[PDB]
Amino acid sequence: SDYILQHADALVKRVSKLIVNEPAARAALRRGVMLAAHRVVAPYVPVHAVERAFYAVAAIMAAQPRSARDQRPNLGVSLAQAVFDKGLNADSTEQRLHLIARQNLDGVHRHLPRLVLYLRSDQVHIDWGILIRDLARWGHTPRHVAREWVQDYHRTLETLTRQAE
Amino acid sequence: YILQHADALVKRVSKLIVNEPAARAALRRGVGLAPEDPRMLAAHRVVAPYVPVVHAVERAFYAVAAIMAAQPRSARDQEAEARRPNLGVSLAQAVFDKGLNADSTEQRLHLIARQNLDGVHRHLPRLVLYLRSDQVHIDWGILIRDLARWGHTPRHVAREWVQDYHRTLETLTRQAE
Amino acid sequence: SGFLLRLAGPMQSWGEHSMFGERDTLPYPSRSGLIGMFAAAQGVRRGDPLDRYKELKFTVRVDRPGVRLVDFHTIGGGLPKERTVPTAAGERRDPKKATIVTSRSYLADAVFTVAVTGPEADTIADALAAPYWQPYLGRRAFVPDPLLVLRRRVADPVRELVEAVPLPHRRVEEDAATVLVDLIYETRTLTVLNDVPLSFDSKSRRYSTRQIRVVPTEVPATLVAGPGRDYQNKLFTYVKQCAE
Amino acid sequence: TFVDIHAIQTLPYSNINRDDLGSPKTVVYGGKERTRVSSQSWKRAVRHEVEARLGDKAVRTRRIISEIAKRLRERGWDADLADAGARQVVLFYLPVPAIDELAAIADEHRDAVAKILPADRITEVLKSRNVSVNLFGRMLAELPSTEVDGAVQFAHAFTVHGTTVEVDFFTAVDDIPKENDHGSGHMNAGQFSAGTFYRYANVNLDRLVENTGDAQTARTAVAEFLRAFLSTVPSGKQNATAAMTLPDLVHIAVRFDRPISFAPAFETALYGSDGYTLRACQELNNYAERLREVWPDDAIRGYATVENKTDLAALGERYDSYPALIDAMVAAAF
Amino acid sequence: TFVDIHAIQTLPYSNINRDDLGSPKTVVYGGKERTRVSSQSWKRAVRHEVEARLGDKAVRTRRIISEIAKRLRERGWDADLADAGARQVVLSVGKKSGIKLEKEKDSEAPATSVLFYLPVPAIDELAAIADEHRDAVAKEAAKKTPKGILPADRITEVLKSRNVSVNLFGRMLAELPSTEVDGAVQFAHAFTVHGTTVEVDFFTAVDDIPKENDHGSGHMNAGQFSAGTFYRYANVNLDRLVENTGDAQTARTAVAEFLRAFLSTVPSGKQNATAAMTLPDLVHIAVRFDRPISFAPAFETALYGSDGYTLRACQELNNYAERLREVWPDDAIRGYATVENKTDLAALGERYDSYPALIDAMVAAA
DNA sequence: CGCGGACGAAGCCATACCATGTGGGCTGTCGCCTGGA
DNA sequence: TCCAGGCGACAGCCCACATGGCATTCCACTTATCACTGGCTTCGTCCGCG
């Protein structure tokens, strides 16, 4: 399962440097949130749910605000770290995680970009690599990864909370 | 090592179910099912921070926490009245005192002790809820740690429940001279 | 001079004091057995003088004791009324009573590291490397370890048993050294037993008493191998420098 | 001069040879329980099949009476009345040197074909083979015969993975019902076990051919032996659990120095939830590789396999089928 | 001279033969649990069907005294004379004091300890031999401990009376090793080709009449069931079967009816509430002249699913039969029928049109 | 009349309540094209 | 021939919910079945065979 993680990592670094470096391909990959993907991320793909897991998160990567654009825990830890540190509401991000963890494959790509972009607007660190292997893993086993996200979120939230006192 | 976490869960869940209904309802709907089943996506909030660090251990925690939240109000009203035994001893104390069927409990005990990791989780919940229907005092921490050790060999946790059950039966009968 | 046999494999059974159906084995090898194996590796038919095998020394370090199992063994059963094992008079028994049942015991899952020290040890080693008869361990049906001769040439092989020989995995406490392993030398002796072989001929088997003294020695914990697949590996790399 | 043979054979849910109490015989190797089939079992099962063919290859094909050609024919003793005995040598099966006596002490006397009782001299067929006595030890119904052994070392067959016995609750049902039904015949419990057994055996033609002679007769005996070793399966409770099978891997090797077994390769038991044949094959390969590169030797290796997935390098040249492998190896043996 | 038969049969959600506690019998094969149907159950269904057609009634029982006494009471003997008579027939066959019996429960005839296996005409003839010595039997009953008076030779020759089911399946009788006939059909256990876990059904038999205040079920419990695609196999040693039967036409009819009953029949274990009757989705008969062979090792590596298992099982049996055929070459006969026309199974021989056609052409070729 | 095969005759038998702790090893990646070194 | 650069122009920001609730009773069965065969000793005689 790591064979997808390494490719996803090469893609995230090359795309990060490419979006801060060249604005043309940045705005061209951002328009999808798709020919640009066929000509940019295609060499980083070895089931089409994996390929869409790559270019979809690539577009989410190119659509982030500059503040968070110029700068291993999964997305659950990322949301817990955002909630405790950067003042996000618990009763709202919890409800959003359940909302995302309950849907099917085509649902996570519809409700995920808004939340990822929103948490990114606070300079939160998303290990994009494992996020790509997570959305790829969403096809093999959905409820297993969703489980990892929710239980991981609550786990690290209460662990850091009790750790703070 | 695990028993300590077991006593933590049993502590806050034993006071939790009686002190507030939200968690009791989020846990009740998780009895006898996988830790990733969507219906139990609401129980992580309470149980996920206590698992340590194989899936048998988490299965044990979630499954028995749900069992503790799905017991009738009678069993909780008696559960909140205020070396140590397994649940086998509980079965013997149930048949000898509360009049259950001996020849049945014996074949249900050997029926459950003779199964695989998944058979103990499917057959277990109704058996333990029946025991709490008869309000026998069952110990939860031992029950979970037992289920936790139920995954490495199906011999080291079954044989001790069966032998402990029969042992305590004949001690309760010999003590009735 | 000398060499280090590695007594291992699926089953071992060095018998003694059993001249009937019930056969038993010792919790450690007996010189009669392994001297029978050398004799089988050099081509001496039963009845030949075994004086050459005198003057030999066998200290054996037990790696793991191994657990004892009883092998049930019926012979001649199910065969028709006119085929079994004859009687001395020649008159067979009734088929319902024809088969004879022997329950021969055997030692299973154990490994010993013997240290042969003798004058003929070099030809014995070169005989085990190419024998004139399948060499076995205790009884014919038991197949020996591939690495039957761990080290072919070593001066003072006893010191090799005391240090720098791989041992199977066992419980070792944290940063603990001085792990005990029993080895038998031959006052303060443990027992006397019929081991010295005087004649192997099937017509008159003849043995004698021999002293045995088990000394529990201490070995540094740097020899205990890992959990699995590590022991056989370490012993392979150990037999690798044999040429050097 | 040592023909070693290894074979992986997976037996289904059955009970080949039970113990003193019903359970199948088990060894505890590498710390774990492992059901096993005794060597005697797989011996009386091979032998009982060898004679069934060798001792029948054939009274209607090669024949024993078909002699004289070297003691009764090209000798002068009635080149036409050759049936002289022949018919006088009847009132098991031998090779050729011990047959010289067959056509030898079959002449002289008178004879009495003019219309035949001296057999205490020919009867010694087993005393000097009876090749079925040089391959395998003495017979089982005849007193010893100078050659009690041997040659064909046979090893016990233990599983390559820990297998625990499993209780098969069974019951007998009587067909004559009274007015209280369900009174079955007799409740009881029979233990069975399944698994993939590893098997091994050695044939020392070196100290073998001597006891016999005609390297061709010896060649036939070893070839039919190998075919019987793969072919046969014991006859224990087969009529109730049909467990007839063929080895999923067959490796015959001809070594000129000493026989060697691959049993320690299966020391660390194999955990499962998957199949065991492929893992066992590639693991036997690995062990053959390290052992081959640690004890280098110029030996011959060949193997057949019922799975074309893996490529077994250390096992030699992959022949196409069992009888081809046996033929090329027996030929390569001399 | 070995008629091998293989068959892939998928049984739905059912419980064919439970264990001593309700659960279905399971094997641990290739590391995974696999529900199985014992061999003796199918063998029983087979015999009852074969003997059903060939109305031979190869009764296996213990109460031979009870039925012999019944036969003697039908033929004029008094109740006590019949009982003592039958006891004389059974008591005159062992070494001394006859075969071993069990403790008599009622005043009813006792049940022997061993299981007999005879046809009904055999029991009838036993009653005849008992009737030939009316006076003698009556004279023995007058004593306190009677002995054998019957001509043990002919009754022992009557117990040896075979039958089609006796010929195929064989008989055992410890106290009479002279009547032991060896079976000619190797029947194997049927294990699934994919790991299947058991599943609990929760049932509550509710009482129809209401109670004054509350209403609860009459009884609640849970039974174990399982579904899956079973593999089944059997061998018929023609040589030994023709040896037991003696003739070759009776033998041929017995093997043909055996095969047809082997495919057709299905056990009677909890079928009244599951309706698990089915037919094999694949049937492969091969006639081998050297040794019988099973395809069990092909199904060692359990099959993962979420898809079907019939096609995978069919093509995998094909693959194993093909490579196995090219590794153990032999001049044997191969034929197969199939209930799925998607793939074409080449290695299984010549595809006949139907099960009975396949059986007819294969038994004929043997 | 001569005789095979099978069984049976015993010696034996055996008044000063409690426990168990274990595991670890496998895999391959790209952006392409022009310019300059 | 291989290493290195390049490849028109493509936006910035800021905000993200508060609360309240999470049920109870009841039911848990019966009976019948649980095998034998033996691995001792020699000789004489006895019933059946040729």
Give the domain ranges of chain E: 1-366
Q: Strand runs (DSSP E) across E206-267, as ranges?
A: 219-237
Whether C163 and C220 have beta carbons less than 8 Å apart is answered as: yes
Is there a contact between C8 and D264 if contact means CB atoms under 8 Å apart?
yes
Chain B residues 90 to 109 whose Cβ lies within 7 Å of strand F are none
Nearest Cβ partner for E197 among B107, B114, B118 = B118
- What whole-number distance in Å separates Cα of residue D324 and Cα of residue C138? 36
Query: Which residues are paired to C108 by β-bridges?
Result: C11, C67
- What whole-number distance in Å separates Cα of residue D305 and Cα of residue D322? 9
Q: Which residues contact B83 (CB under 8 A, 6 or more apart)?
A: none
Give which of D216, D198, D228 is closest to D333, Cα–Cα: D216
Distance from CA of E287 to the nearest CA of D (A): 15
Residue B172 backbone zone (phi > 0: left; psi -120 to 50: alpha; other: beta): alpha
Find which of B109, B111, B130, B162 to mutate to test the E interface (most E CBs within 10 Å of its CB). Answer: B111
Q: How many CB atoms lie under 10 A from the CB of residue A3?
A: 9
Report the residue numbers after which chain A has a gap, meaning the C atom sits over 2.5 angstroms from the next written residue's N, or none. 33, 46, 71
Q: Indicate the number of domains in chain B.
A: 1
**DSSP state letter for A74:** -
Q: In 3-state terms, what secondary structure has residue E297?
A: helix
Task: Fill in the amino acid letter for C225.
Answer: A
Q: The domain containing residue A98 runs over which residues? A: 1-165
Nearest-Å Rg of the Cα atoms of chain A is 16
At which residue do the structure tokens 């509550």 appear?
E204
- What whole-number distance in Å separates Cα of residue E189 and Cα of residue E38? 5
**Helix or strand holding residue A130 (H, E):** helix A128-140
Distance from CA of B34 to the nearest CA of E (A): 15
- What whole-number distance in Å separates Cα of residue A98 and Cα of residue A119? 16
Instruction: List subunits contacting chain D, requiring 3 or more Cβ pairs under 8 Å.
Output: C, E
At which residue do the structure tokens 């040439």 appear?
C153
- What whole-number distance in Å separates Cα of residue D142 and Cα of residue D128? 13
- What whole-number distance in Å separates Cα of residue E246 and Cα of residue E242? 5
At which residue do the structure tokens 């079959």 appear?
D106
Distance from CA of B117 to the nearest CA of A (A): 19
Is there a contact between B116 and E202 if contact means CB atoms under 8 Å apart?
no
**Helix or strand holding residue C193 (H, E):** strand C191-199
φ and ψ of E164, to 5 deg: -60, -45
Q: Which residues contact D281 (CB under 8 A, 6 or more apart)?
A: D8, D248, D249, D305, D307, D310, D312
Give which of E59, E263, E259, E50 is closest to E164, Cα–Cα: E50
φ and ψ of E154, to 5 deg: -75, -40
Tell me how far apart the terminal alpha carbons of chain D are, to the nearest angstrom.
9
Kindly report the bases of strand G lying within 7 A of a protein C-beta atom: 7-13, 15-19, 21-41
Chain A hits for B48, CB-CB cut-off 8 Å, are 150-152, 154-155
Q: D130 preceded by cis ω (within 30°)? A: yes
Is there a contact between E21 and B111 if contact means CB atoms under 8 Å apart?
yes
The reported resolution of this PDB entry, expressed in Å, is 3.7
Q: Indicate the number of domains in chain C.
A: 1
- What whole-number distance in Å separates Cα of residue D209 and Cα of residue D95? 11
Buried b (16+ CB within 10 A) or exposed e, D126-163: bbbbbbbbbbbbbbeeeeebebebbbbbbbbbbbbbbb
Chain C hits for D158, CB-CB cut-off 8 Å, are 10
Angle between helices A105-120 and A128-140 (to 10 degrees): 160
Which pair of structure tokens corresponds to residue E30? 């290739």
d(CA A14, C1' G16) / Å? 31
Q: How many CB atoms lie under 10 A from the CB of residue E319?
A: 15
At which residue do the structure tokens 């017991």 appear?
B71
- What whole-number distance in Å separates Cα of residue C230 and Cα of residue E197? 36
**Nearest residue: Cα versus C1' of G10:** A24
A13 touches strand F (CB under 7 A): no
Kindly report the bases of strand F lying within 7 A of a protein C-beta atom: 6-8, 18-24, 27-32
Is there a contact between E294 and D172 if contact means CB atoms under 8 Å apart?
no
> Rounded to 10 degrees, what is the CA torsion of A30, A35, A40, A43?
140
- What whole-number distance in Å separates Cα of residue E27 and Cα of residue D321? 31
Strands D166-172 and D186-204: antiparallel
φ and ψ of C22, to 5 deg: -65, 115
Q: Which residues contact E322 (CB under 8 A, 6 or more apart)?
A: E346, E347
- What whole-number distance in Å separates Cα of residue C157 and Cα of residue C61? 11
Give which of C101, C69, C46 is closest to D40, Cα–Cα: C101
**Nearest residue: Cα versus C1' of G25:** E214
Give which of D232, D319, D225 is closest to D11, Cα–Cα: D232
Distance from CA of E186 to the nearest CA of D (A): 4
E95 touches strand F (CB under 7 A): yes
Is there a contact between E60 and D278 if contact means CB atoms under 8 Å apart?
no
Q: In 3-state terms, what secondary structure has residue E118?
A: coil
**C-alpha separations of E109 from D60, D130, E101, E104, E175 in Å:** 58, 58, 10, 7, 20
Chain E hits for D181, CB-CB cut-off 8 Å, are none
Give which of C61, C59, C51, C60 is closest to C120, Cα–Cα: C51
- What whole-number distance in Å separates Cα of residue E45 and Cα of residue E57? 13
Q: D253 preceded by cis ω (within 30°)? A: no
Chain E hits for D244, CB-CB cut-off 8 Å, are 186, 235, 291-294
Tell me how far apart the terminal alpha carbons of chain E are, to the nearest angstrom.
7
Residue C180: exposure state from Cβ atoms within 10 A (0-12, 13-18, ≥19): exposed
Find which of E34, E189, E193, E317 to mutate to test the D interface (most D CBs within 10 Å of its CB). Answer: E189
Is there a contact between E300 and D322 if contact means CB atoms under 8 Å apart?
no
Distance from CA of A76 to the nearest CA of B (A): 12
Whether E198 and E23 have beta carbons less than 8 Å apart is answered as: yes
Give which of C67, C65, C70, C66 is closest to C105, Cα–Cα: C70
**C-alpha separations of D310 from C55, D249, D304, D316 in Å:** 52, 12, 12, 14
Is there a contact between E200 and B122 if contact means CB atoms under 8 Å apart?
yes
Residue E189: exposure state from Cβ atoms within 10 A (0-12, 13-18, ≥19): buried
Whether C228 and D268 have beta carbons less than 8 Å apart is answered as: yes
Cα nearest neighbour of D11 on chain E: E297
Is there a contact between A150 and B48 if contact means CB atoms under 8 Å apart?
yes
Q: The domain containing residue C18 runs over which residues? A: 1-244
Nearest Cβ partner for E21 among B107, B118, B122 = B107
For A158, how many CA atoms within 13 A lie in the half-sphere containing its CB?
13
d(CA A123, C1' G9) / Å? 29
- What whole-number distance in Å separates Cα of residue C25 and Cα of residue E211? 73
A7 touches strand F (CB under 7 A): yes
Find which of A83, A104, A150 to mutate to test the B interface (most B CBs within 10 Å of its CB). Answer: A150
Find which of D50, D278, D306 to mutate to test the E interface (most E CBs within 10 Å of its CB). Answer: D306
Spell out which chain B residues touch chain E, with contact meaning CB-CB distance below 8 angstroms.
107, 110-111, 114-116, 118-119, 122-123, 126
d(CA B7, C1' F17) / Å? 29
Chain D hits for E183, CB-CB cut-off 8 Å, are 239
**C-alpha separations of E360 from A97, B61, E1, E165, E260 in Å:** 66, 61, 16, 20, 10
Which pair of structure tokens corresponds to residue D61? 């094909």
- What whole-number distance in Å separates Cα of residue D267 and Cα of residue D161? 9
Q: How many CB atoms lie under 10 A from the CB of residue B47?
A: 25
